[PDB]
């Protein structure tokens, strides 16, 4: 049968090149006979022999009669949807899990755990599902609202790592971590280090010893928190990084908050999920940024890199490496992912378009995959080709 | 090859959650481009390594113009079919099993074995099949609407017991049990005890010597006929479960019937079919039950329990466990059914929610599933989320 | 891997009873959301583990404007498709094979054989795929309408023979016999006795030394001329089956064609399939029959029986076992077919239903399936439930 | 587990049939309920158990409202899409493999690849895939249009090899070619000979030590340049096929190039792609060629042959073997394809079959393919039977 999972050094490359393109609702038009569901939130977990593309729909889909509450986060239709990696998520297509309005996944090199947030905001839960099964759930500590990544989980020879959070938007929302192994949870860890306000953590491995998330903090910095997490220790240690190419959408200019790297300047309220990857090298790693080309909005998408040094102290701004998507087109939530190749780990980010006609209509994304390919300089950027009355 | 199976210990868990919504007609609107078919009587039965989502179709979909005749129980078009669970019943993800008015399905470790009822009112027919193939029938004995569960059906060891009956639904209505092995029937259990009115059994395994259902009375009582079928020695007993909280409905105040266990009370004409699941531990066993909110109608549900103590003598009340459905939404039929972990059985409870905008129009149910998870409190409820005028 | 195919005896049953009904129609209202087929000459063939719906569709789908030149037979469009049996004919669940507007198939124990046939009227030919693969061609011998079975072939061992013809329908159409092995023809048979007009036959093992086809003779008689082929001189006869209850359409009253067996008598221009089904018991056989209702049109469709005897000197008259389809439903083409249980074969009784709205509309029909099971009679007939006015 | 592919000896056969016809426009109609891909570009590639029909997508459908663009060759929306070979590519069936303008794809026995090509036209990638990893990308050489085979690539004993090019329609486009083994270019081969413009490189194996490819010349001739590369030196040479029968289009009169079979002859300014297939026989070997009917449009096409002999010397006409597409009928472009039997291959030309109403509609093909069977003569032709206006 099935061994466990655990990373490898990634392929070879030296640049990210544009993969895939999934705009379900360039098949939405009235006068179309598809059917694409309501969704945000993607999101793409490749186990061993396949990948698939998650999102949270909102039970609806396009054209339809149900528009009204798809810009909402949290209500009682929202469900964890799948289909495997490169066909359209329609109605048919469509696997549904279990509802939840906030979601994880990946796959241990033998099956599937998904994840699912649900309930009321006051008391939500997170529920936990091994392939078919309700397994366990893990109850809301800070009263206000239990969330999760909306990323990929990561599994490391049996053992699965997700991080999780609770509090205010606007305040103190402190993040534990869950080690879940067939499906049940083995361990709750409590960071340490910087703590008043982690969330939406992209995690990956950055080895076998070590896991590394950025993530959001929605109120006091434009930084984002950096999760460092000792899978031999389980222990957890969180930081700020340094780096004066700020992460966070708002953000001001670069380089503008003054002072040593764990100051946070001023609130810029508000943050958004960005893709981080690992690109581990023998001697060496890589680690991959993308943020909004915007600074006050969620408009294009840039990616960056920076090889070894560390997160937490490295003042120095980030090496750009071109741009996904042009200040023209949406860049919403990124996070990253990996595919199995048979002897190497291939490094991804994907990056939510949002179709944002605001208020009275629909609202659903795109789906941008760019993957490390070869060498040179990024080539292209994605468009949806999206057109918000037909 | 493959192994049978037998029930195990339940997995972990002390209280139910909400695990998930197949809404069908979410996409039926007439702007829509779906094709949901018109079904009701839903069930689910979980083979090892799968779950599927049964149900009896009117042979048509919504939207459609075959709306007239849905709303009735018995004609010539109703079909059994099905869907790997997690997937909407539309008409081409839906494959159509065999031809019948009434049913009930279950996996034996090794194959489907699939039951439909049709033919004349006053001789309808039990149907088998094994997998792919008509192995067997069973004829009308009381030429009264010969029918069956509704639920999924008990294997232990590959041998399968089911629950028929026949006789009127205001009088008496005496069900016998049938022992397939391998799609044909090896034996013709005649139960013992009272035996005025049984219909419409859930039965699950209570251990691996004795299955129990709740069933329904349509006429003489307002509790629920409770069976132990003993697997070792063939033989059925049945008597009333003696619970102050009345099970079927309509039913009158709870605690209202007065006198011995065995005293039926008034008639409250008519019933409904209610999930019952047992939770089988090392040193005790719960057993689940869940009723209609209404009293006189299909509004609601909530769902109970009480561990150990006999269904047949206790007259107390169950403690009640939680909402799963709102007075303002529609619960009709009840199932309960059990996810196959590797080393435990994971119990659910199934609710129909019946979208019935009455007499001109199309009749389809949802189905919102509950199922065992952790600890603590249920903690939410389900709304189907339809709007019959789209 | 898999073993070669051969037929045993069959399951224990009495009667045949109503199976399933596939209406894709049911589903092509133009105010629904579906896609069914125009096909006709639908059968099912059974291989181990599955069985196929196999039938020529006129590359056109129910809602639709290429409903002109749907009630004829022979163009270029035309297909043969196939889905697994339970599922509906539509665009996307069918897979087409290759084209044809005649043709056959049968499932080795090993792999599909699919046989086609097209080209000019004058020049047409059969076609072979094994599999994936085309492998082989047989060419037209009498140059006029070079046809095939429209049923299953029938495999024993490795080998599987099919019947073709070639001629005129008023006049002679002598058929001949081709005996595939893995795709490619490893032989030609050419019967003996009666030859004048055989069309059409279905097919079916008689035991394993012999397949036994009732097919249609479209001039001289309104009988069946009956096939017998052995398999292990690969030697075939035919002569008209004596039965006074006559199985082609249109017939005369029964009993009333005076003389001995080998008598047409009168002409009665024109036949129609009619399916045939053997019942291989250990000390006997049973052979299954089935006829229009109608004696002049295509309307309702009722079975017979009679075990054993002779099918070629018996005069007597069929028993009659009940109808499948009322003479206010349709009943045109039949076949008969094979489920494989695992210790013995379930024989089966298809019924073409066409809906035929005429000369100007679209053209289709549905398949009602009747297979042996239990005892006691028949019990129910199938109906469309199509309006073609939706 | 799985083993490389190498060619073998075709199966036996002496000319092509009609094999099959994937129109999906023909469930096109705004009245129908389908989705088929405005899609052009598309090939067959078979593996051992099975053949995929790719195509790219202008990632729309029809019906719909996304027409505007679709005539147009590159953009940022095009896709590579697969449907196995059968299967309507409908927007639920395909499955979208990566992003490109320009495609070539083949299965080396153990798995698929994909190659895909993007970017600026200043400077365009060659993208490969194997399996579902990004495993390598090749940049532009001559900066003017990087694009690939557009038909299927060679996989012998591990290694694949595929055709690429870069420059001027009008001028040079000097092709190399690719040796890729498990999703990696493991060598870059630059062919010899008269190198001015080849490009669209129908390729195939003319045995286990060459490979051979008709190809595009867009500018300085009516003529083929004929490749054959030496799988066991790596090396290339290319030179114009000598037969009088002219296979590019635009063409003038067969015959009319006076001069040594090295010589162009006029410009003839244009190209398209031809399929191109052998019949690798024990003693001898069959290449198959089609062009359009007509000699300036792409109306129409014929199939021919000419056992034997040099492909780059022979001034000699081919045999004509049929028509396959009539004048009346689009014939644009053709490739050729190979599918695997147990112990033969078995050749087949695919036949792209263009709707063109044009510039301001909708702009998808058909595909009609023909493969070798039996003997005699090619006895029917394809049309798509499809009208633009519905
Ligand atoms: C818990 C929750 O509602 N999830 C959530 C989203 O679904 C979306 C966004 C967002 O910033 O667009 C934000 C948040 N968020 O609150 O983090
Ligand atoms: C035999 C039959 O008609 N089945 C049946 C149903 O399908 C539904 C109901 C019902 O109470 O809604 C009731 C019954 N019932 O009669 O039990
Ligand atoms: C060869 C051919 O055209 N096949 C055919 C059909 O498809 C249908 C019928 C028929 O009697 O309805 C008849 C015939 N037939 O001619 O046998
Ligand atoms: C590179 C590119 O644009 N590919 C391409 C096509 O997609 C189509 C045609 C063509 O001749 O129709 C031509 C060409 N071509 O330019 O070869
Ligand atoms: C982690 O462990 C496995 C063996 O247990 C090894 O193959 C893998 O490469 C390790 N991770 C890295 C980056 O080396
Ligand atoms: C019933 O039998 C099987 C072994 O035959 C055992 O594993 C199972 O646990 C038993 N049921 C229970 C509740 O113990
Ligand atoms: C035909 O042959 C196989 C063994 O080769 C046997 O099992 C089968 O039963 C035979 N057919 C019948 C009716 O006995
Ligand atoms: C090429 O090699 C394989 C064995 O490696 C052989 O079977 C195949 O036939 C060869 N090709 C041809 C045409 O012989
Ligand atoms: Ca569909
Ligand atoms: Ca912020
Ligand atoms: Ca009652
Ligand atoms: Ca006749
Ligand atoms: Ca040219």
């Given at each position: ?168 938007a606007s ?45 959001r903090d929605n109120s006091?910095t434009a ?25 966070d959408t708002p953000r ?15 609130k810029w309220l508000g943050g958004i ?23 006050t909005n969620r ?92």
């Open positions: 049968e099935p061994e466990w999972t655990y990373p490898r050094l990634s392929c070879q490359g030296s640049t990210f090149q544009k993969a895939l393109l999934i705009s379900p609702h360039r098949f939405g038009e009235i006068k179309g006979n598809s059917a694409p569901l309501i969704i945000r939130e993607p999101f793409v977990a490749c186990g061993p022999k396949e990948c698939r593309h998650f999102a949270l729909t909102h039970y609806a889909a396009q054209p339809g009669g149900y528009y009204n509450g798809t810009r909402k986060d949290r209500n009682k239709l929202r469900h964890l949807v799948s289909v495997k990696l490169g066909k359209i998520p329609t109605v048919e297509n469509s696997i549904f899990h279990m509802a939840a309005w906030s979601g994880s996944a990946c796959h241990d090199g033998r099956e599937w755990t998904y994840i699912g947030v649900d309930g009321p905001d006051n008391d939500a839960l997170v529920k936990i599902k091994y392939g078919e099964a309700y397994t366990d759930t893990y109850h809301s500590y800070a009263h206000n609202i239990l969330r999760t990544q909306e990323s990929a989980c990561n599994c490391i020879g049996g053992d699965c790592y997700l991080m999780i959070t609770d509090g205010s305040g103190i929302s402190k993040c534990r971590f869950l080690k879940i192994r067939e499906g049940r949870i083995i361990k709750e860890i409590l960071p340490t280090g910087r703590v008043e306000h982690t969330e939406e953590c992209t995690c990956g491995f950055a080895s076998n010893k070590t896991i590394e998330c950025a993530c006091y930084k984002r928190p950096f999760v460092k997490l000792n899978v031999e220790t389980d222990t957890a240690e969180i930081r700020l990084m340094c780096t004066k190419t700020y992460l001001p200019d670069d380089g503008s908050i003054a002072g040593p790297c764990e100051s946070n300047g001023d999920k960005g893709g981080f990857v690992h690109q581990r090298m023998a001697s060496k790693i890589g680690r991959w940024y993308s943020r909004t080309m915007s600074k408009m294009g998408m840039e990616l960056y890199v920076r090889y070894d040094g560390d997160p937490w102290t490295d003042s120095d701004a980030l090496t750009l490496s071109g741009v996904m998507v042009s200040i023209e087109e949406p860049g919403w939530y990124s996070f990253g992912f990996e595919i199995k190749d048979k002897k190497c780990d291939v490094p991804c980010i994907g990056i939510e378009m949002v179709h944002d006609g605001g208020k009275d209509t629909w609202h659903s994304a795109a789906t941008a995959i760019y993957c490390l390919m070869g060498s040179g300089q990024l080539l292209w950027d994605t468009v949806t080709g999206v057109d918000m009355a037909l």
